[PDB]
Amino acid sequence: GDIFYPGYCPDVKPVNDFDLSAFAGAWHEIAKLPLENENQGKCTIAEYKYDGKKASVYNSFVSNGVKEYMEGDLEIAPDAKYTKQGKYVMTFKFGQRVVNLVPWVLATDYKNYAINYNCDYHPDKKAHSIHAWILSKSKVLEGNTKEVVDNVLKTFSHLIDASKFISNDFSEAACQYSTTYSLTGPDRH
Amino acid sequence: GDIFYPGYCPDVKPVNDFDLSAFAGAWHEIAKLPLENENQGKCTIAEYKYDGKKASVYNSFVSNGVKEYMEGDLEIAPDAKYTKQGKYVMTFKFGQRVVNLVPWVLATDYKNYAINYNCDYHPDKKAHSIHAWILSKSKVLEGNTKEVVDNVLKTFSHLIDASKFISNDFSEAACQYSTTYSLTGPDRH
Ligand SMILES: C=Cc1c(/C=c2\[nH]/c(=C\C3=NC(=O)C(CCC(=O)O)=C3C)c(C=C)c2C)[nH]c(/C=C2\NC(=O)C(CCC(=O)O)=C2C)c1C
Numbered sequence: 001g002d003i004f005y006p007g008y009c010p011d012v013k014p015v016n017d018f019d020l021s022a023f024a025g026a027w028h029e030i031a032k033l034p035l036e037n038e039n040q041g042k043c044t045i046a047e048y049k050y051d052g053k054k055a056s057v058y059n060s061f062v063s064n065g066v067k068e069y070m071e072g073d074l075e076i077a078p079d080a081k082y083t084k085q086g087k088y089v090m091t092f093k094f095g096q097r098v099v100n101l102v103p104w105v106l107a108t109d110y111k112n113y114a115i116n117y118n119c120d121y122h123p124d125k126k127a128h129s130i131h132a133w134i135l136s137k138s139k140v141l142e143g144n145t146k147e148v149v150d151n152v153l154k155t156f157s158h159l160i161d162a163s164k165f166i167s168n169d170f171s172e173a174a175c176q177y178s179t180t181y182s183l184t185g186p187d188r189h
Numbered sequence: 190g191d192i193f194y195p196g197y198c199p200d201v202k203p204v205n206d207f208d209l210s211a212f213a214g215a216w217h218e219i220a221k222l223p224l225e226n227e228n229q230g231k232c233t234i235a236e237y238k239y240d241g242k243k244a245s246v247y248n249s250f251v252s253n254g255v256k257e258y259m260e261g262d263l264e265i266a267p268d269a270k271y272t273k274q275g276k277y278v279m280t281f282k283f284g285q286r287v288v289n290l291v292p293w294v295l296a297t298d299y300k301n302y303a304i305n306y307n308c309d310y311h312p313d314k315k316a317h318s319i320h321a322w323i324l325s326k327s328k329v330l331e332g333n334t335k336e337v338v339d340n341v342l343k344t345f346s347h348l349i350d351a352s353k354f355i356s357n358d359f360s361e362a363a364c365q366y367s368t369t370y371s372l373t374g375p376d377r378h
C-alpha cells in the first residue's frame with residue numbers, strides 16, 4: 001500500500017530557478033516510495049523532450065516482457081510560472097479520461113540526478129499519502145553522485161523517509177521486452 | 190496518552206515581534222491538547238510577571254482540593270533573542286533536577302488570547318508528540334475573541350488538530366482549594 005501519514009500535506013517548497021530545458025532528457029527511476037500504479041514495472045524511465053515552446057513526455061516500463069508506455073504533454077505548473085520553482089504538469093488522456101500529474105522537484109543538478117515528490121491529501125481519511133522518486137540520467141547512481149544524492153536527501157528527512165525507498169532494476173533482463181503497449185490512447189478509459 | 194504523529198517535528202515559526210512585557214499577566218488555560226503532567230489539574234492558570242530585567246513564573250492548578258503550584262524563572266529563548274520571535278524558557282527546579290520548558294507562541298493579541306505549542310521528538314520512536322494550549326486573560330473565551338481564536342487556529346490546521354482540544358474548568362467549584370502544595374522546591378526530586 002502507499003505510504004500515508006496523518007493530517008494535511010506539510011509545507012514544502014520545490015527547487016528554485018527551475019530550468020526545463022536543462023531538465024529535459026531520459027530519467028531512470030533508481031528508486032521510489034511505493035506507488036500503486038507503478039509498483040510492478042521495472043526498468044522504469046521517464047523521458048521528457050523540450051522544444052522551447054513545447055514539451056512532451058514518454059513514460060515506460062516493463063511488466064512480464066511487455067513494454068508499457070504513456071505519451072503526454074508536459075508543462076510548467078501555472079503557479080510555478082510566476083515563482084520559477086520546479087513544478088510541472090503531465091497530462092495524459094485515456095479515452096475521455098484526462099489526467100494531470102504534478103510532480104514537485106525538490107532538488108536536482110540537471111545533468112545527473114533529480115529528487116521528485118508529491119503529497120496527496122485524502123479528506124475522507126484525514127491523512128495524506130507521500131510519493132517520491134530518485135531519478136538519474138544514468139542507469140546507476142554512481143559513487144560521487146550517490147553521495148551527493150544522499151546528502152541532499154538528508155536535508156529532506158522531515159518530508160521523506162529514505163528508508164522506505166524501493167530500488168528499481170535496469171538489468172538487461174529487466175529491460176527486455178518482446179512486445180509493447182500503449183496505456184494512453186483514444187480507445188482507452 | 191499524549192498525541193504522537195510519525196516523523197520529526199514539522200517546520201514551524203512562532204509569532205514575530207514578540208513583546209514580553211505585553212505578554213506578562215495571568216493566563217487561563219481554556220483548553221489544551223492532552224499533556225500527561227497536567228491532565229488532572231483544573232482551574233489551570235499560568236502567571237508571568239516581568240520586571241524589565243527579570244521575569245518569573247507562577248503556575249498553578251487544583252487537584253482534589255489541593256492547589257498545586259510551581260515557581261520558576263522565565264526568559265526569552267536564546268535563539269529568539271536574535272529573531273525577536275515568541276519563544277520562551279521556563280526553568281523550574283525540583284531539588285537537583287532542573288527543567289527547561291520551552292513553549293512556542295504561535296499567535297497572540299497580548300490582551301486577550303495566546304496560542305502556544307511545542308513538539309517533542311522521540312528518536313527511539315521515530316515519532317513526535319504535539320502539545321498545545323489555548324490561553325486567555327479571562328476565565329472565558331468570549332464571543333468576539335472566540336471567533337478571533339477560531340480563525341487564527343485555522344491557519345494552523347496543519348500543525349494542530351483542533352478537534353483534539355480538551356476544555357479546562359474555571360467554575361468556583363473547580364478552583365476551590367482547602368490547601369496548597371509547592372511542586373517545585375529544594376526538598377523535591
Ligand atoms: C519516474 C518519474 C515519474 C513517473 C514515472 C512513471 N509512471 C509510469 C506509469 C504510470 N503513471 C501513471 O499515472 C499510471 C496510471 C495511468 C492511469 O491513470 O490509468 C501508470 C500506469 C511510467 C511507465 C508507464 C513511468 C515511467 N511518474 C511520476 C509521477 C507521478 N505518477 C503518479 O501516479 C503521480 C500521482 C501520484 C498520486 O496519486 O498522488 C505522479 C506525480 C514521476 C515523477
Ligand SMILES: C=Cc1c(/C=c2\[nH]/c(=C\C3=NC(=O)C(CCC(=O)O)=C3C)c(C=C)c2C)[nH]c(/C=C2\NC(=O)C(CCC(=O)O)=C2C)c1C
Nearest residue numbers: 218226227234235248249250257258290291292305307309
Ligand atoms: C498553561 C500554560 C502552560 C503550562 C501550564 C501549567 N503546567 C502546570 C503543571 C506542570 N508543568 C510541569 O512541567 C509539570 C511536571 C513538573 C515535573 O517535572 O515534575 C507539572 C505538574 C501548571 C500547574 C502546576 C500549569 C499552570 N505548561 C506549559 C508548557 C509546558 N508544560 C510542559 O510540560 C511542557 C513540555 C511538554 C513536553 O514534554 O514536550 C511545556 C512546553 C504552558 C504553555
